[PDB]
Design a protein around this nucleic acid. Sequence first.
RNA 1: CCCCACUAUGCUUAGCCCUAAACCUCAACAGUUAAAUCAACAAAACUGCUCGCCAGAACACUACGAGCCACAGCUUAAAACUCAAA
Lengths: 135, 137, 100, 49, 86, 97
Amino acid sequence: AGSRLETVGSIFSRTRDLVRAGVLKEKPLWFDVYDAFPPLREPVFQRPRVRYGKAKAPIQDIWYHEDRIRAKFYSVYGSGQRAFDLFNPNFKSTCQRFVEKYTELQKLGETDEEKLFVETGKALLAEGVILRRVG
Amino acid sequence: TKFSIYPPIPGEESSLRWAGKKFEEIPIAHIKASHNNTQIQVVSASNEPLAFASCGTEGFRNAKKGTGIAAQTAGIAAAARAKQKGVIHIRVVVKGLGPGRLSAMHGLIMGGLEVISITDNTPIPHXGCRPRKARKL
Amino acid sequence: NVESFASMLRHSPLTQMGPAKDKLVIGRIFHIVENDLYIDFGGKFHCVCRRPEVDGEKYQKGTRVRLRLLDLELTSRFLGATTDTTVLEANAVLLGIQES
Amino acid sequence: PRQRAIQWGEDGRPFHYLFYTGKQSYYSLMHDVYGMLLNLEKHQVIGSR
Amino acid sequence: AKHLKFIARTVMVQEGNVESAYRTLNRILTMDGLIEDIKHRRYYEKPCRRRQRESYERCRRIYNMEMARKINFLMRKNRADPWQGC
Amino acid sequence: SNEDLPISMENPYKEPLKKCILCGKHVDYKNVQLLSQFVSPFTGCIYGRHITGLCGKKQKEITKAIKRAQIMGFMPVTYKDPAYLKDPKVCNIRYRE
RNA sequence: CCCCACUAUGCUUAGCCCUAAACCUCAACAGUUAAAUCAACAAAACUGCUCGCCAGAACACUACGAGCCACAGCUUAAAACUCAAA
Ligand code: FES
Ligand SMILES: [K+]
Ligand SMILES: [Mg+2]
Ligand SMILES: [Mg+2]
Ligand SMILES: [Mg+2]
Ligand SMILES: [Mg+2]
Ligand SMILES: [Mg+2]
Ligand SMILES: [Mg+2]
Ligand SMILES: [Mg+2]
Ligand SMILES: [Mg+2]
């Protein structure tokens, strides 16, 4: 004697109730473990509903301040002919090297945007980096 | 020079010639391909009639006029009378989507005429007279 | 002083790459089926590229190659669909082999 | 007719790790053949039917 | 009638190949919609009937383009089985 | 709180929207050369936007310009003026043989 | 039903007539997407508020009355007899 109403509550609530009513003679092997270490959410069936009107998902786009520097660098200088190595967790691309120098010069008190971008290109050229302008 | 499907424009200086004649001087074979008949008239560049043949004038009657073989026969007849008058090259102007639209042109070729161009002049009104009501079949 | 997830994500190469369209990346061939090369390049999904006509035999399991990425995940929503259809693979163009 | 042996003991645990497929013998063979094909890659008629 | 002649709907014949010239002319008139226009004009189509067919044609074109796009997208995985035996 | 958390802003990598070949240019009924690029060479038929690639706004301006030029005596109706047959082909239509 | 001919008519002008499967077959305005998503199909399901309208079928886009440039018309619109369905 039991319940296969998977859309009525959860396996825990259905099992706990039928144990109280005496329908289930013994508790299942998992019941005591669930009780001591329950999930964060009780697994209750829900019907996913579609959003309408002014309802929107709460997920937000992930952006960083340096993304503005990356967008300009790719526009001005394009993607580096050097290839990304996404397997190395400490890989640094030419754009990242540009962004780090751009951040260093901003902390030195410079605040102009068009001026802070031209000085950064010169610094890297002095260090031997190849920066071929796209246009 | 590469071949151009676009006809030579009058007043411009083209190098194309047919028996020493320019495109503007080639006679015209007017083919009216109707649903129940096909009429062919060959005229000179000055609009002088040279030959006329239709499926009806070739001894076809009723539904037999509206066949390809009847139009082909009409083309051969018009070609023969036109060839006697000195026509070799013709410009084809066909109006209508009848069964003798293409067959009438074949007959002109089998009759000894050389088609240098094909022009469609099927009348399409741009808004015009109301056509007859649809048929219930 | 335990690094947070927000820090790992900010400084990850995949985050730093930005958009993937027209980005050169290094991939690794991990599976081959006839002339179909399955290449992982550090993303969620692998890409499948046909063996190049020239130097086809140089492309073997483990061979590292250069790719021009087009999409990290090929997905599209078709008319009358509540979600997006995904083919579970990235779109990339195989340029050649990476050598030292 | 040959009788298939018990597929679990007294504790109720099936002997074969592919029991719950219902075709443990067939799928175990596919697993063994698929496994051999993999090792080859890592390493690399008339009278019979 | 008032326009110049032998410019509109005029195709020149190459090397006496009149069959290929006629097919080119017919293809031109078809692509520009003149052939279908001539046929629909033999009998009067009533305005309610024209709207119904134009609406039907526009919905069928969209449905076919959307069904072609789906198959093109879902044919990327038509490659051989990578995990045969599993 | 935490410096590495995402920050709210507008997409910095967003690409500009597409533009038609005539976006930002005045379409005059007297410029028959431009208008002739959007009519059929053989029949003079105005091309739909799926052939011209124009947007709704410029498709409308071109259409209205052609109709004005035709009836005012600047542009032929039944064929493309042969003077403009060698102009840049900007329409996605293949005709000959 | 098919073919041909031709008229009222389709057009203009000035008056009428006031109907339509006049139909997104979705009343106006405002709001919501979380609840149970929801008889079915149509077109995802609802809330507030207001007006209009409906109360078995058929009789009945009818009768009579009244109004109307309408006079073989339109609008509004019953009853008796009948049925256990529609
Ligand atoms: S896209 Fe801007 S006017 Fe066409
Ligand atoms: K309707
Ligand atoms: Mg009359
Ligand atoms: Mg009028
Ligand atoms: Mg209506
Ligand atoms: Mg109201
Ligand atoms: Mg009633
Ligand atoms: Mg009525
Ligand atoms: Mg009445
Ligand atoms: Mg009365």
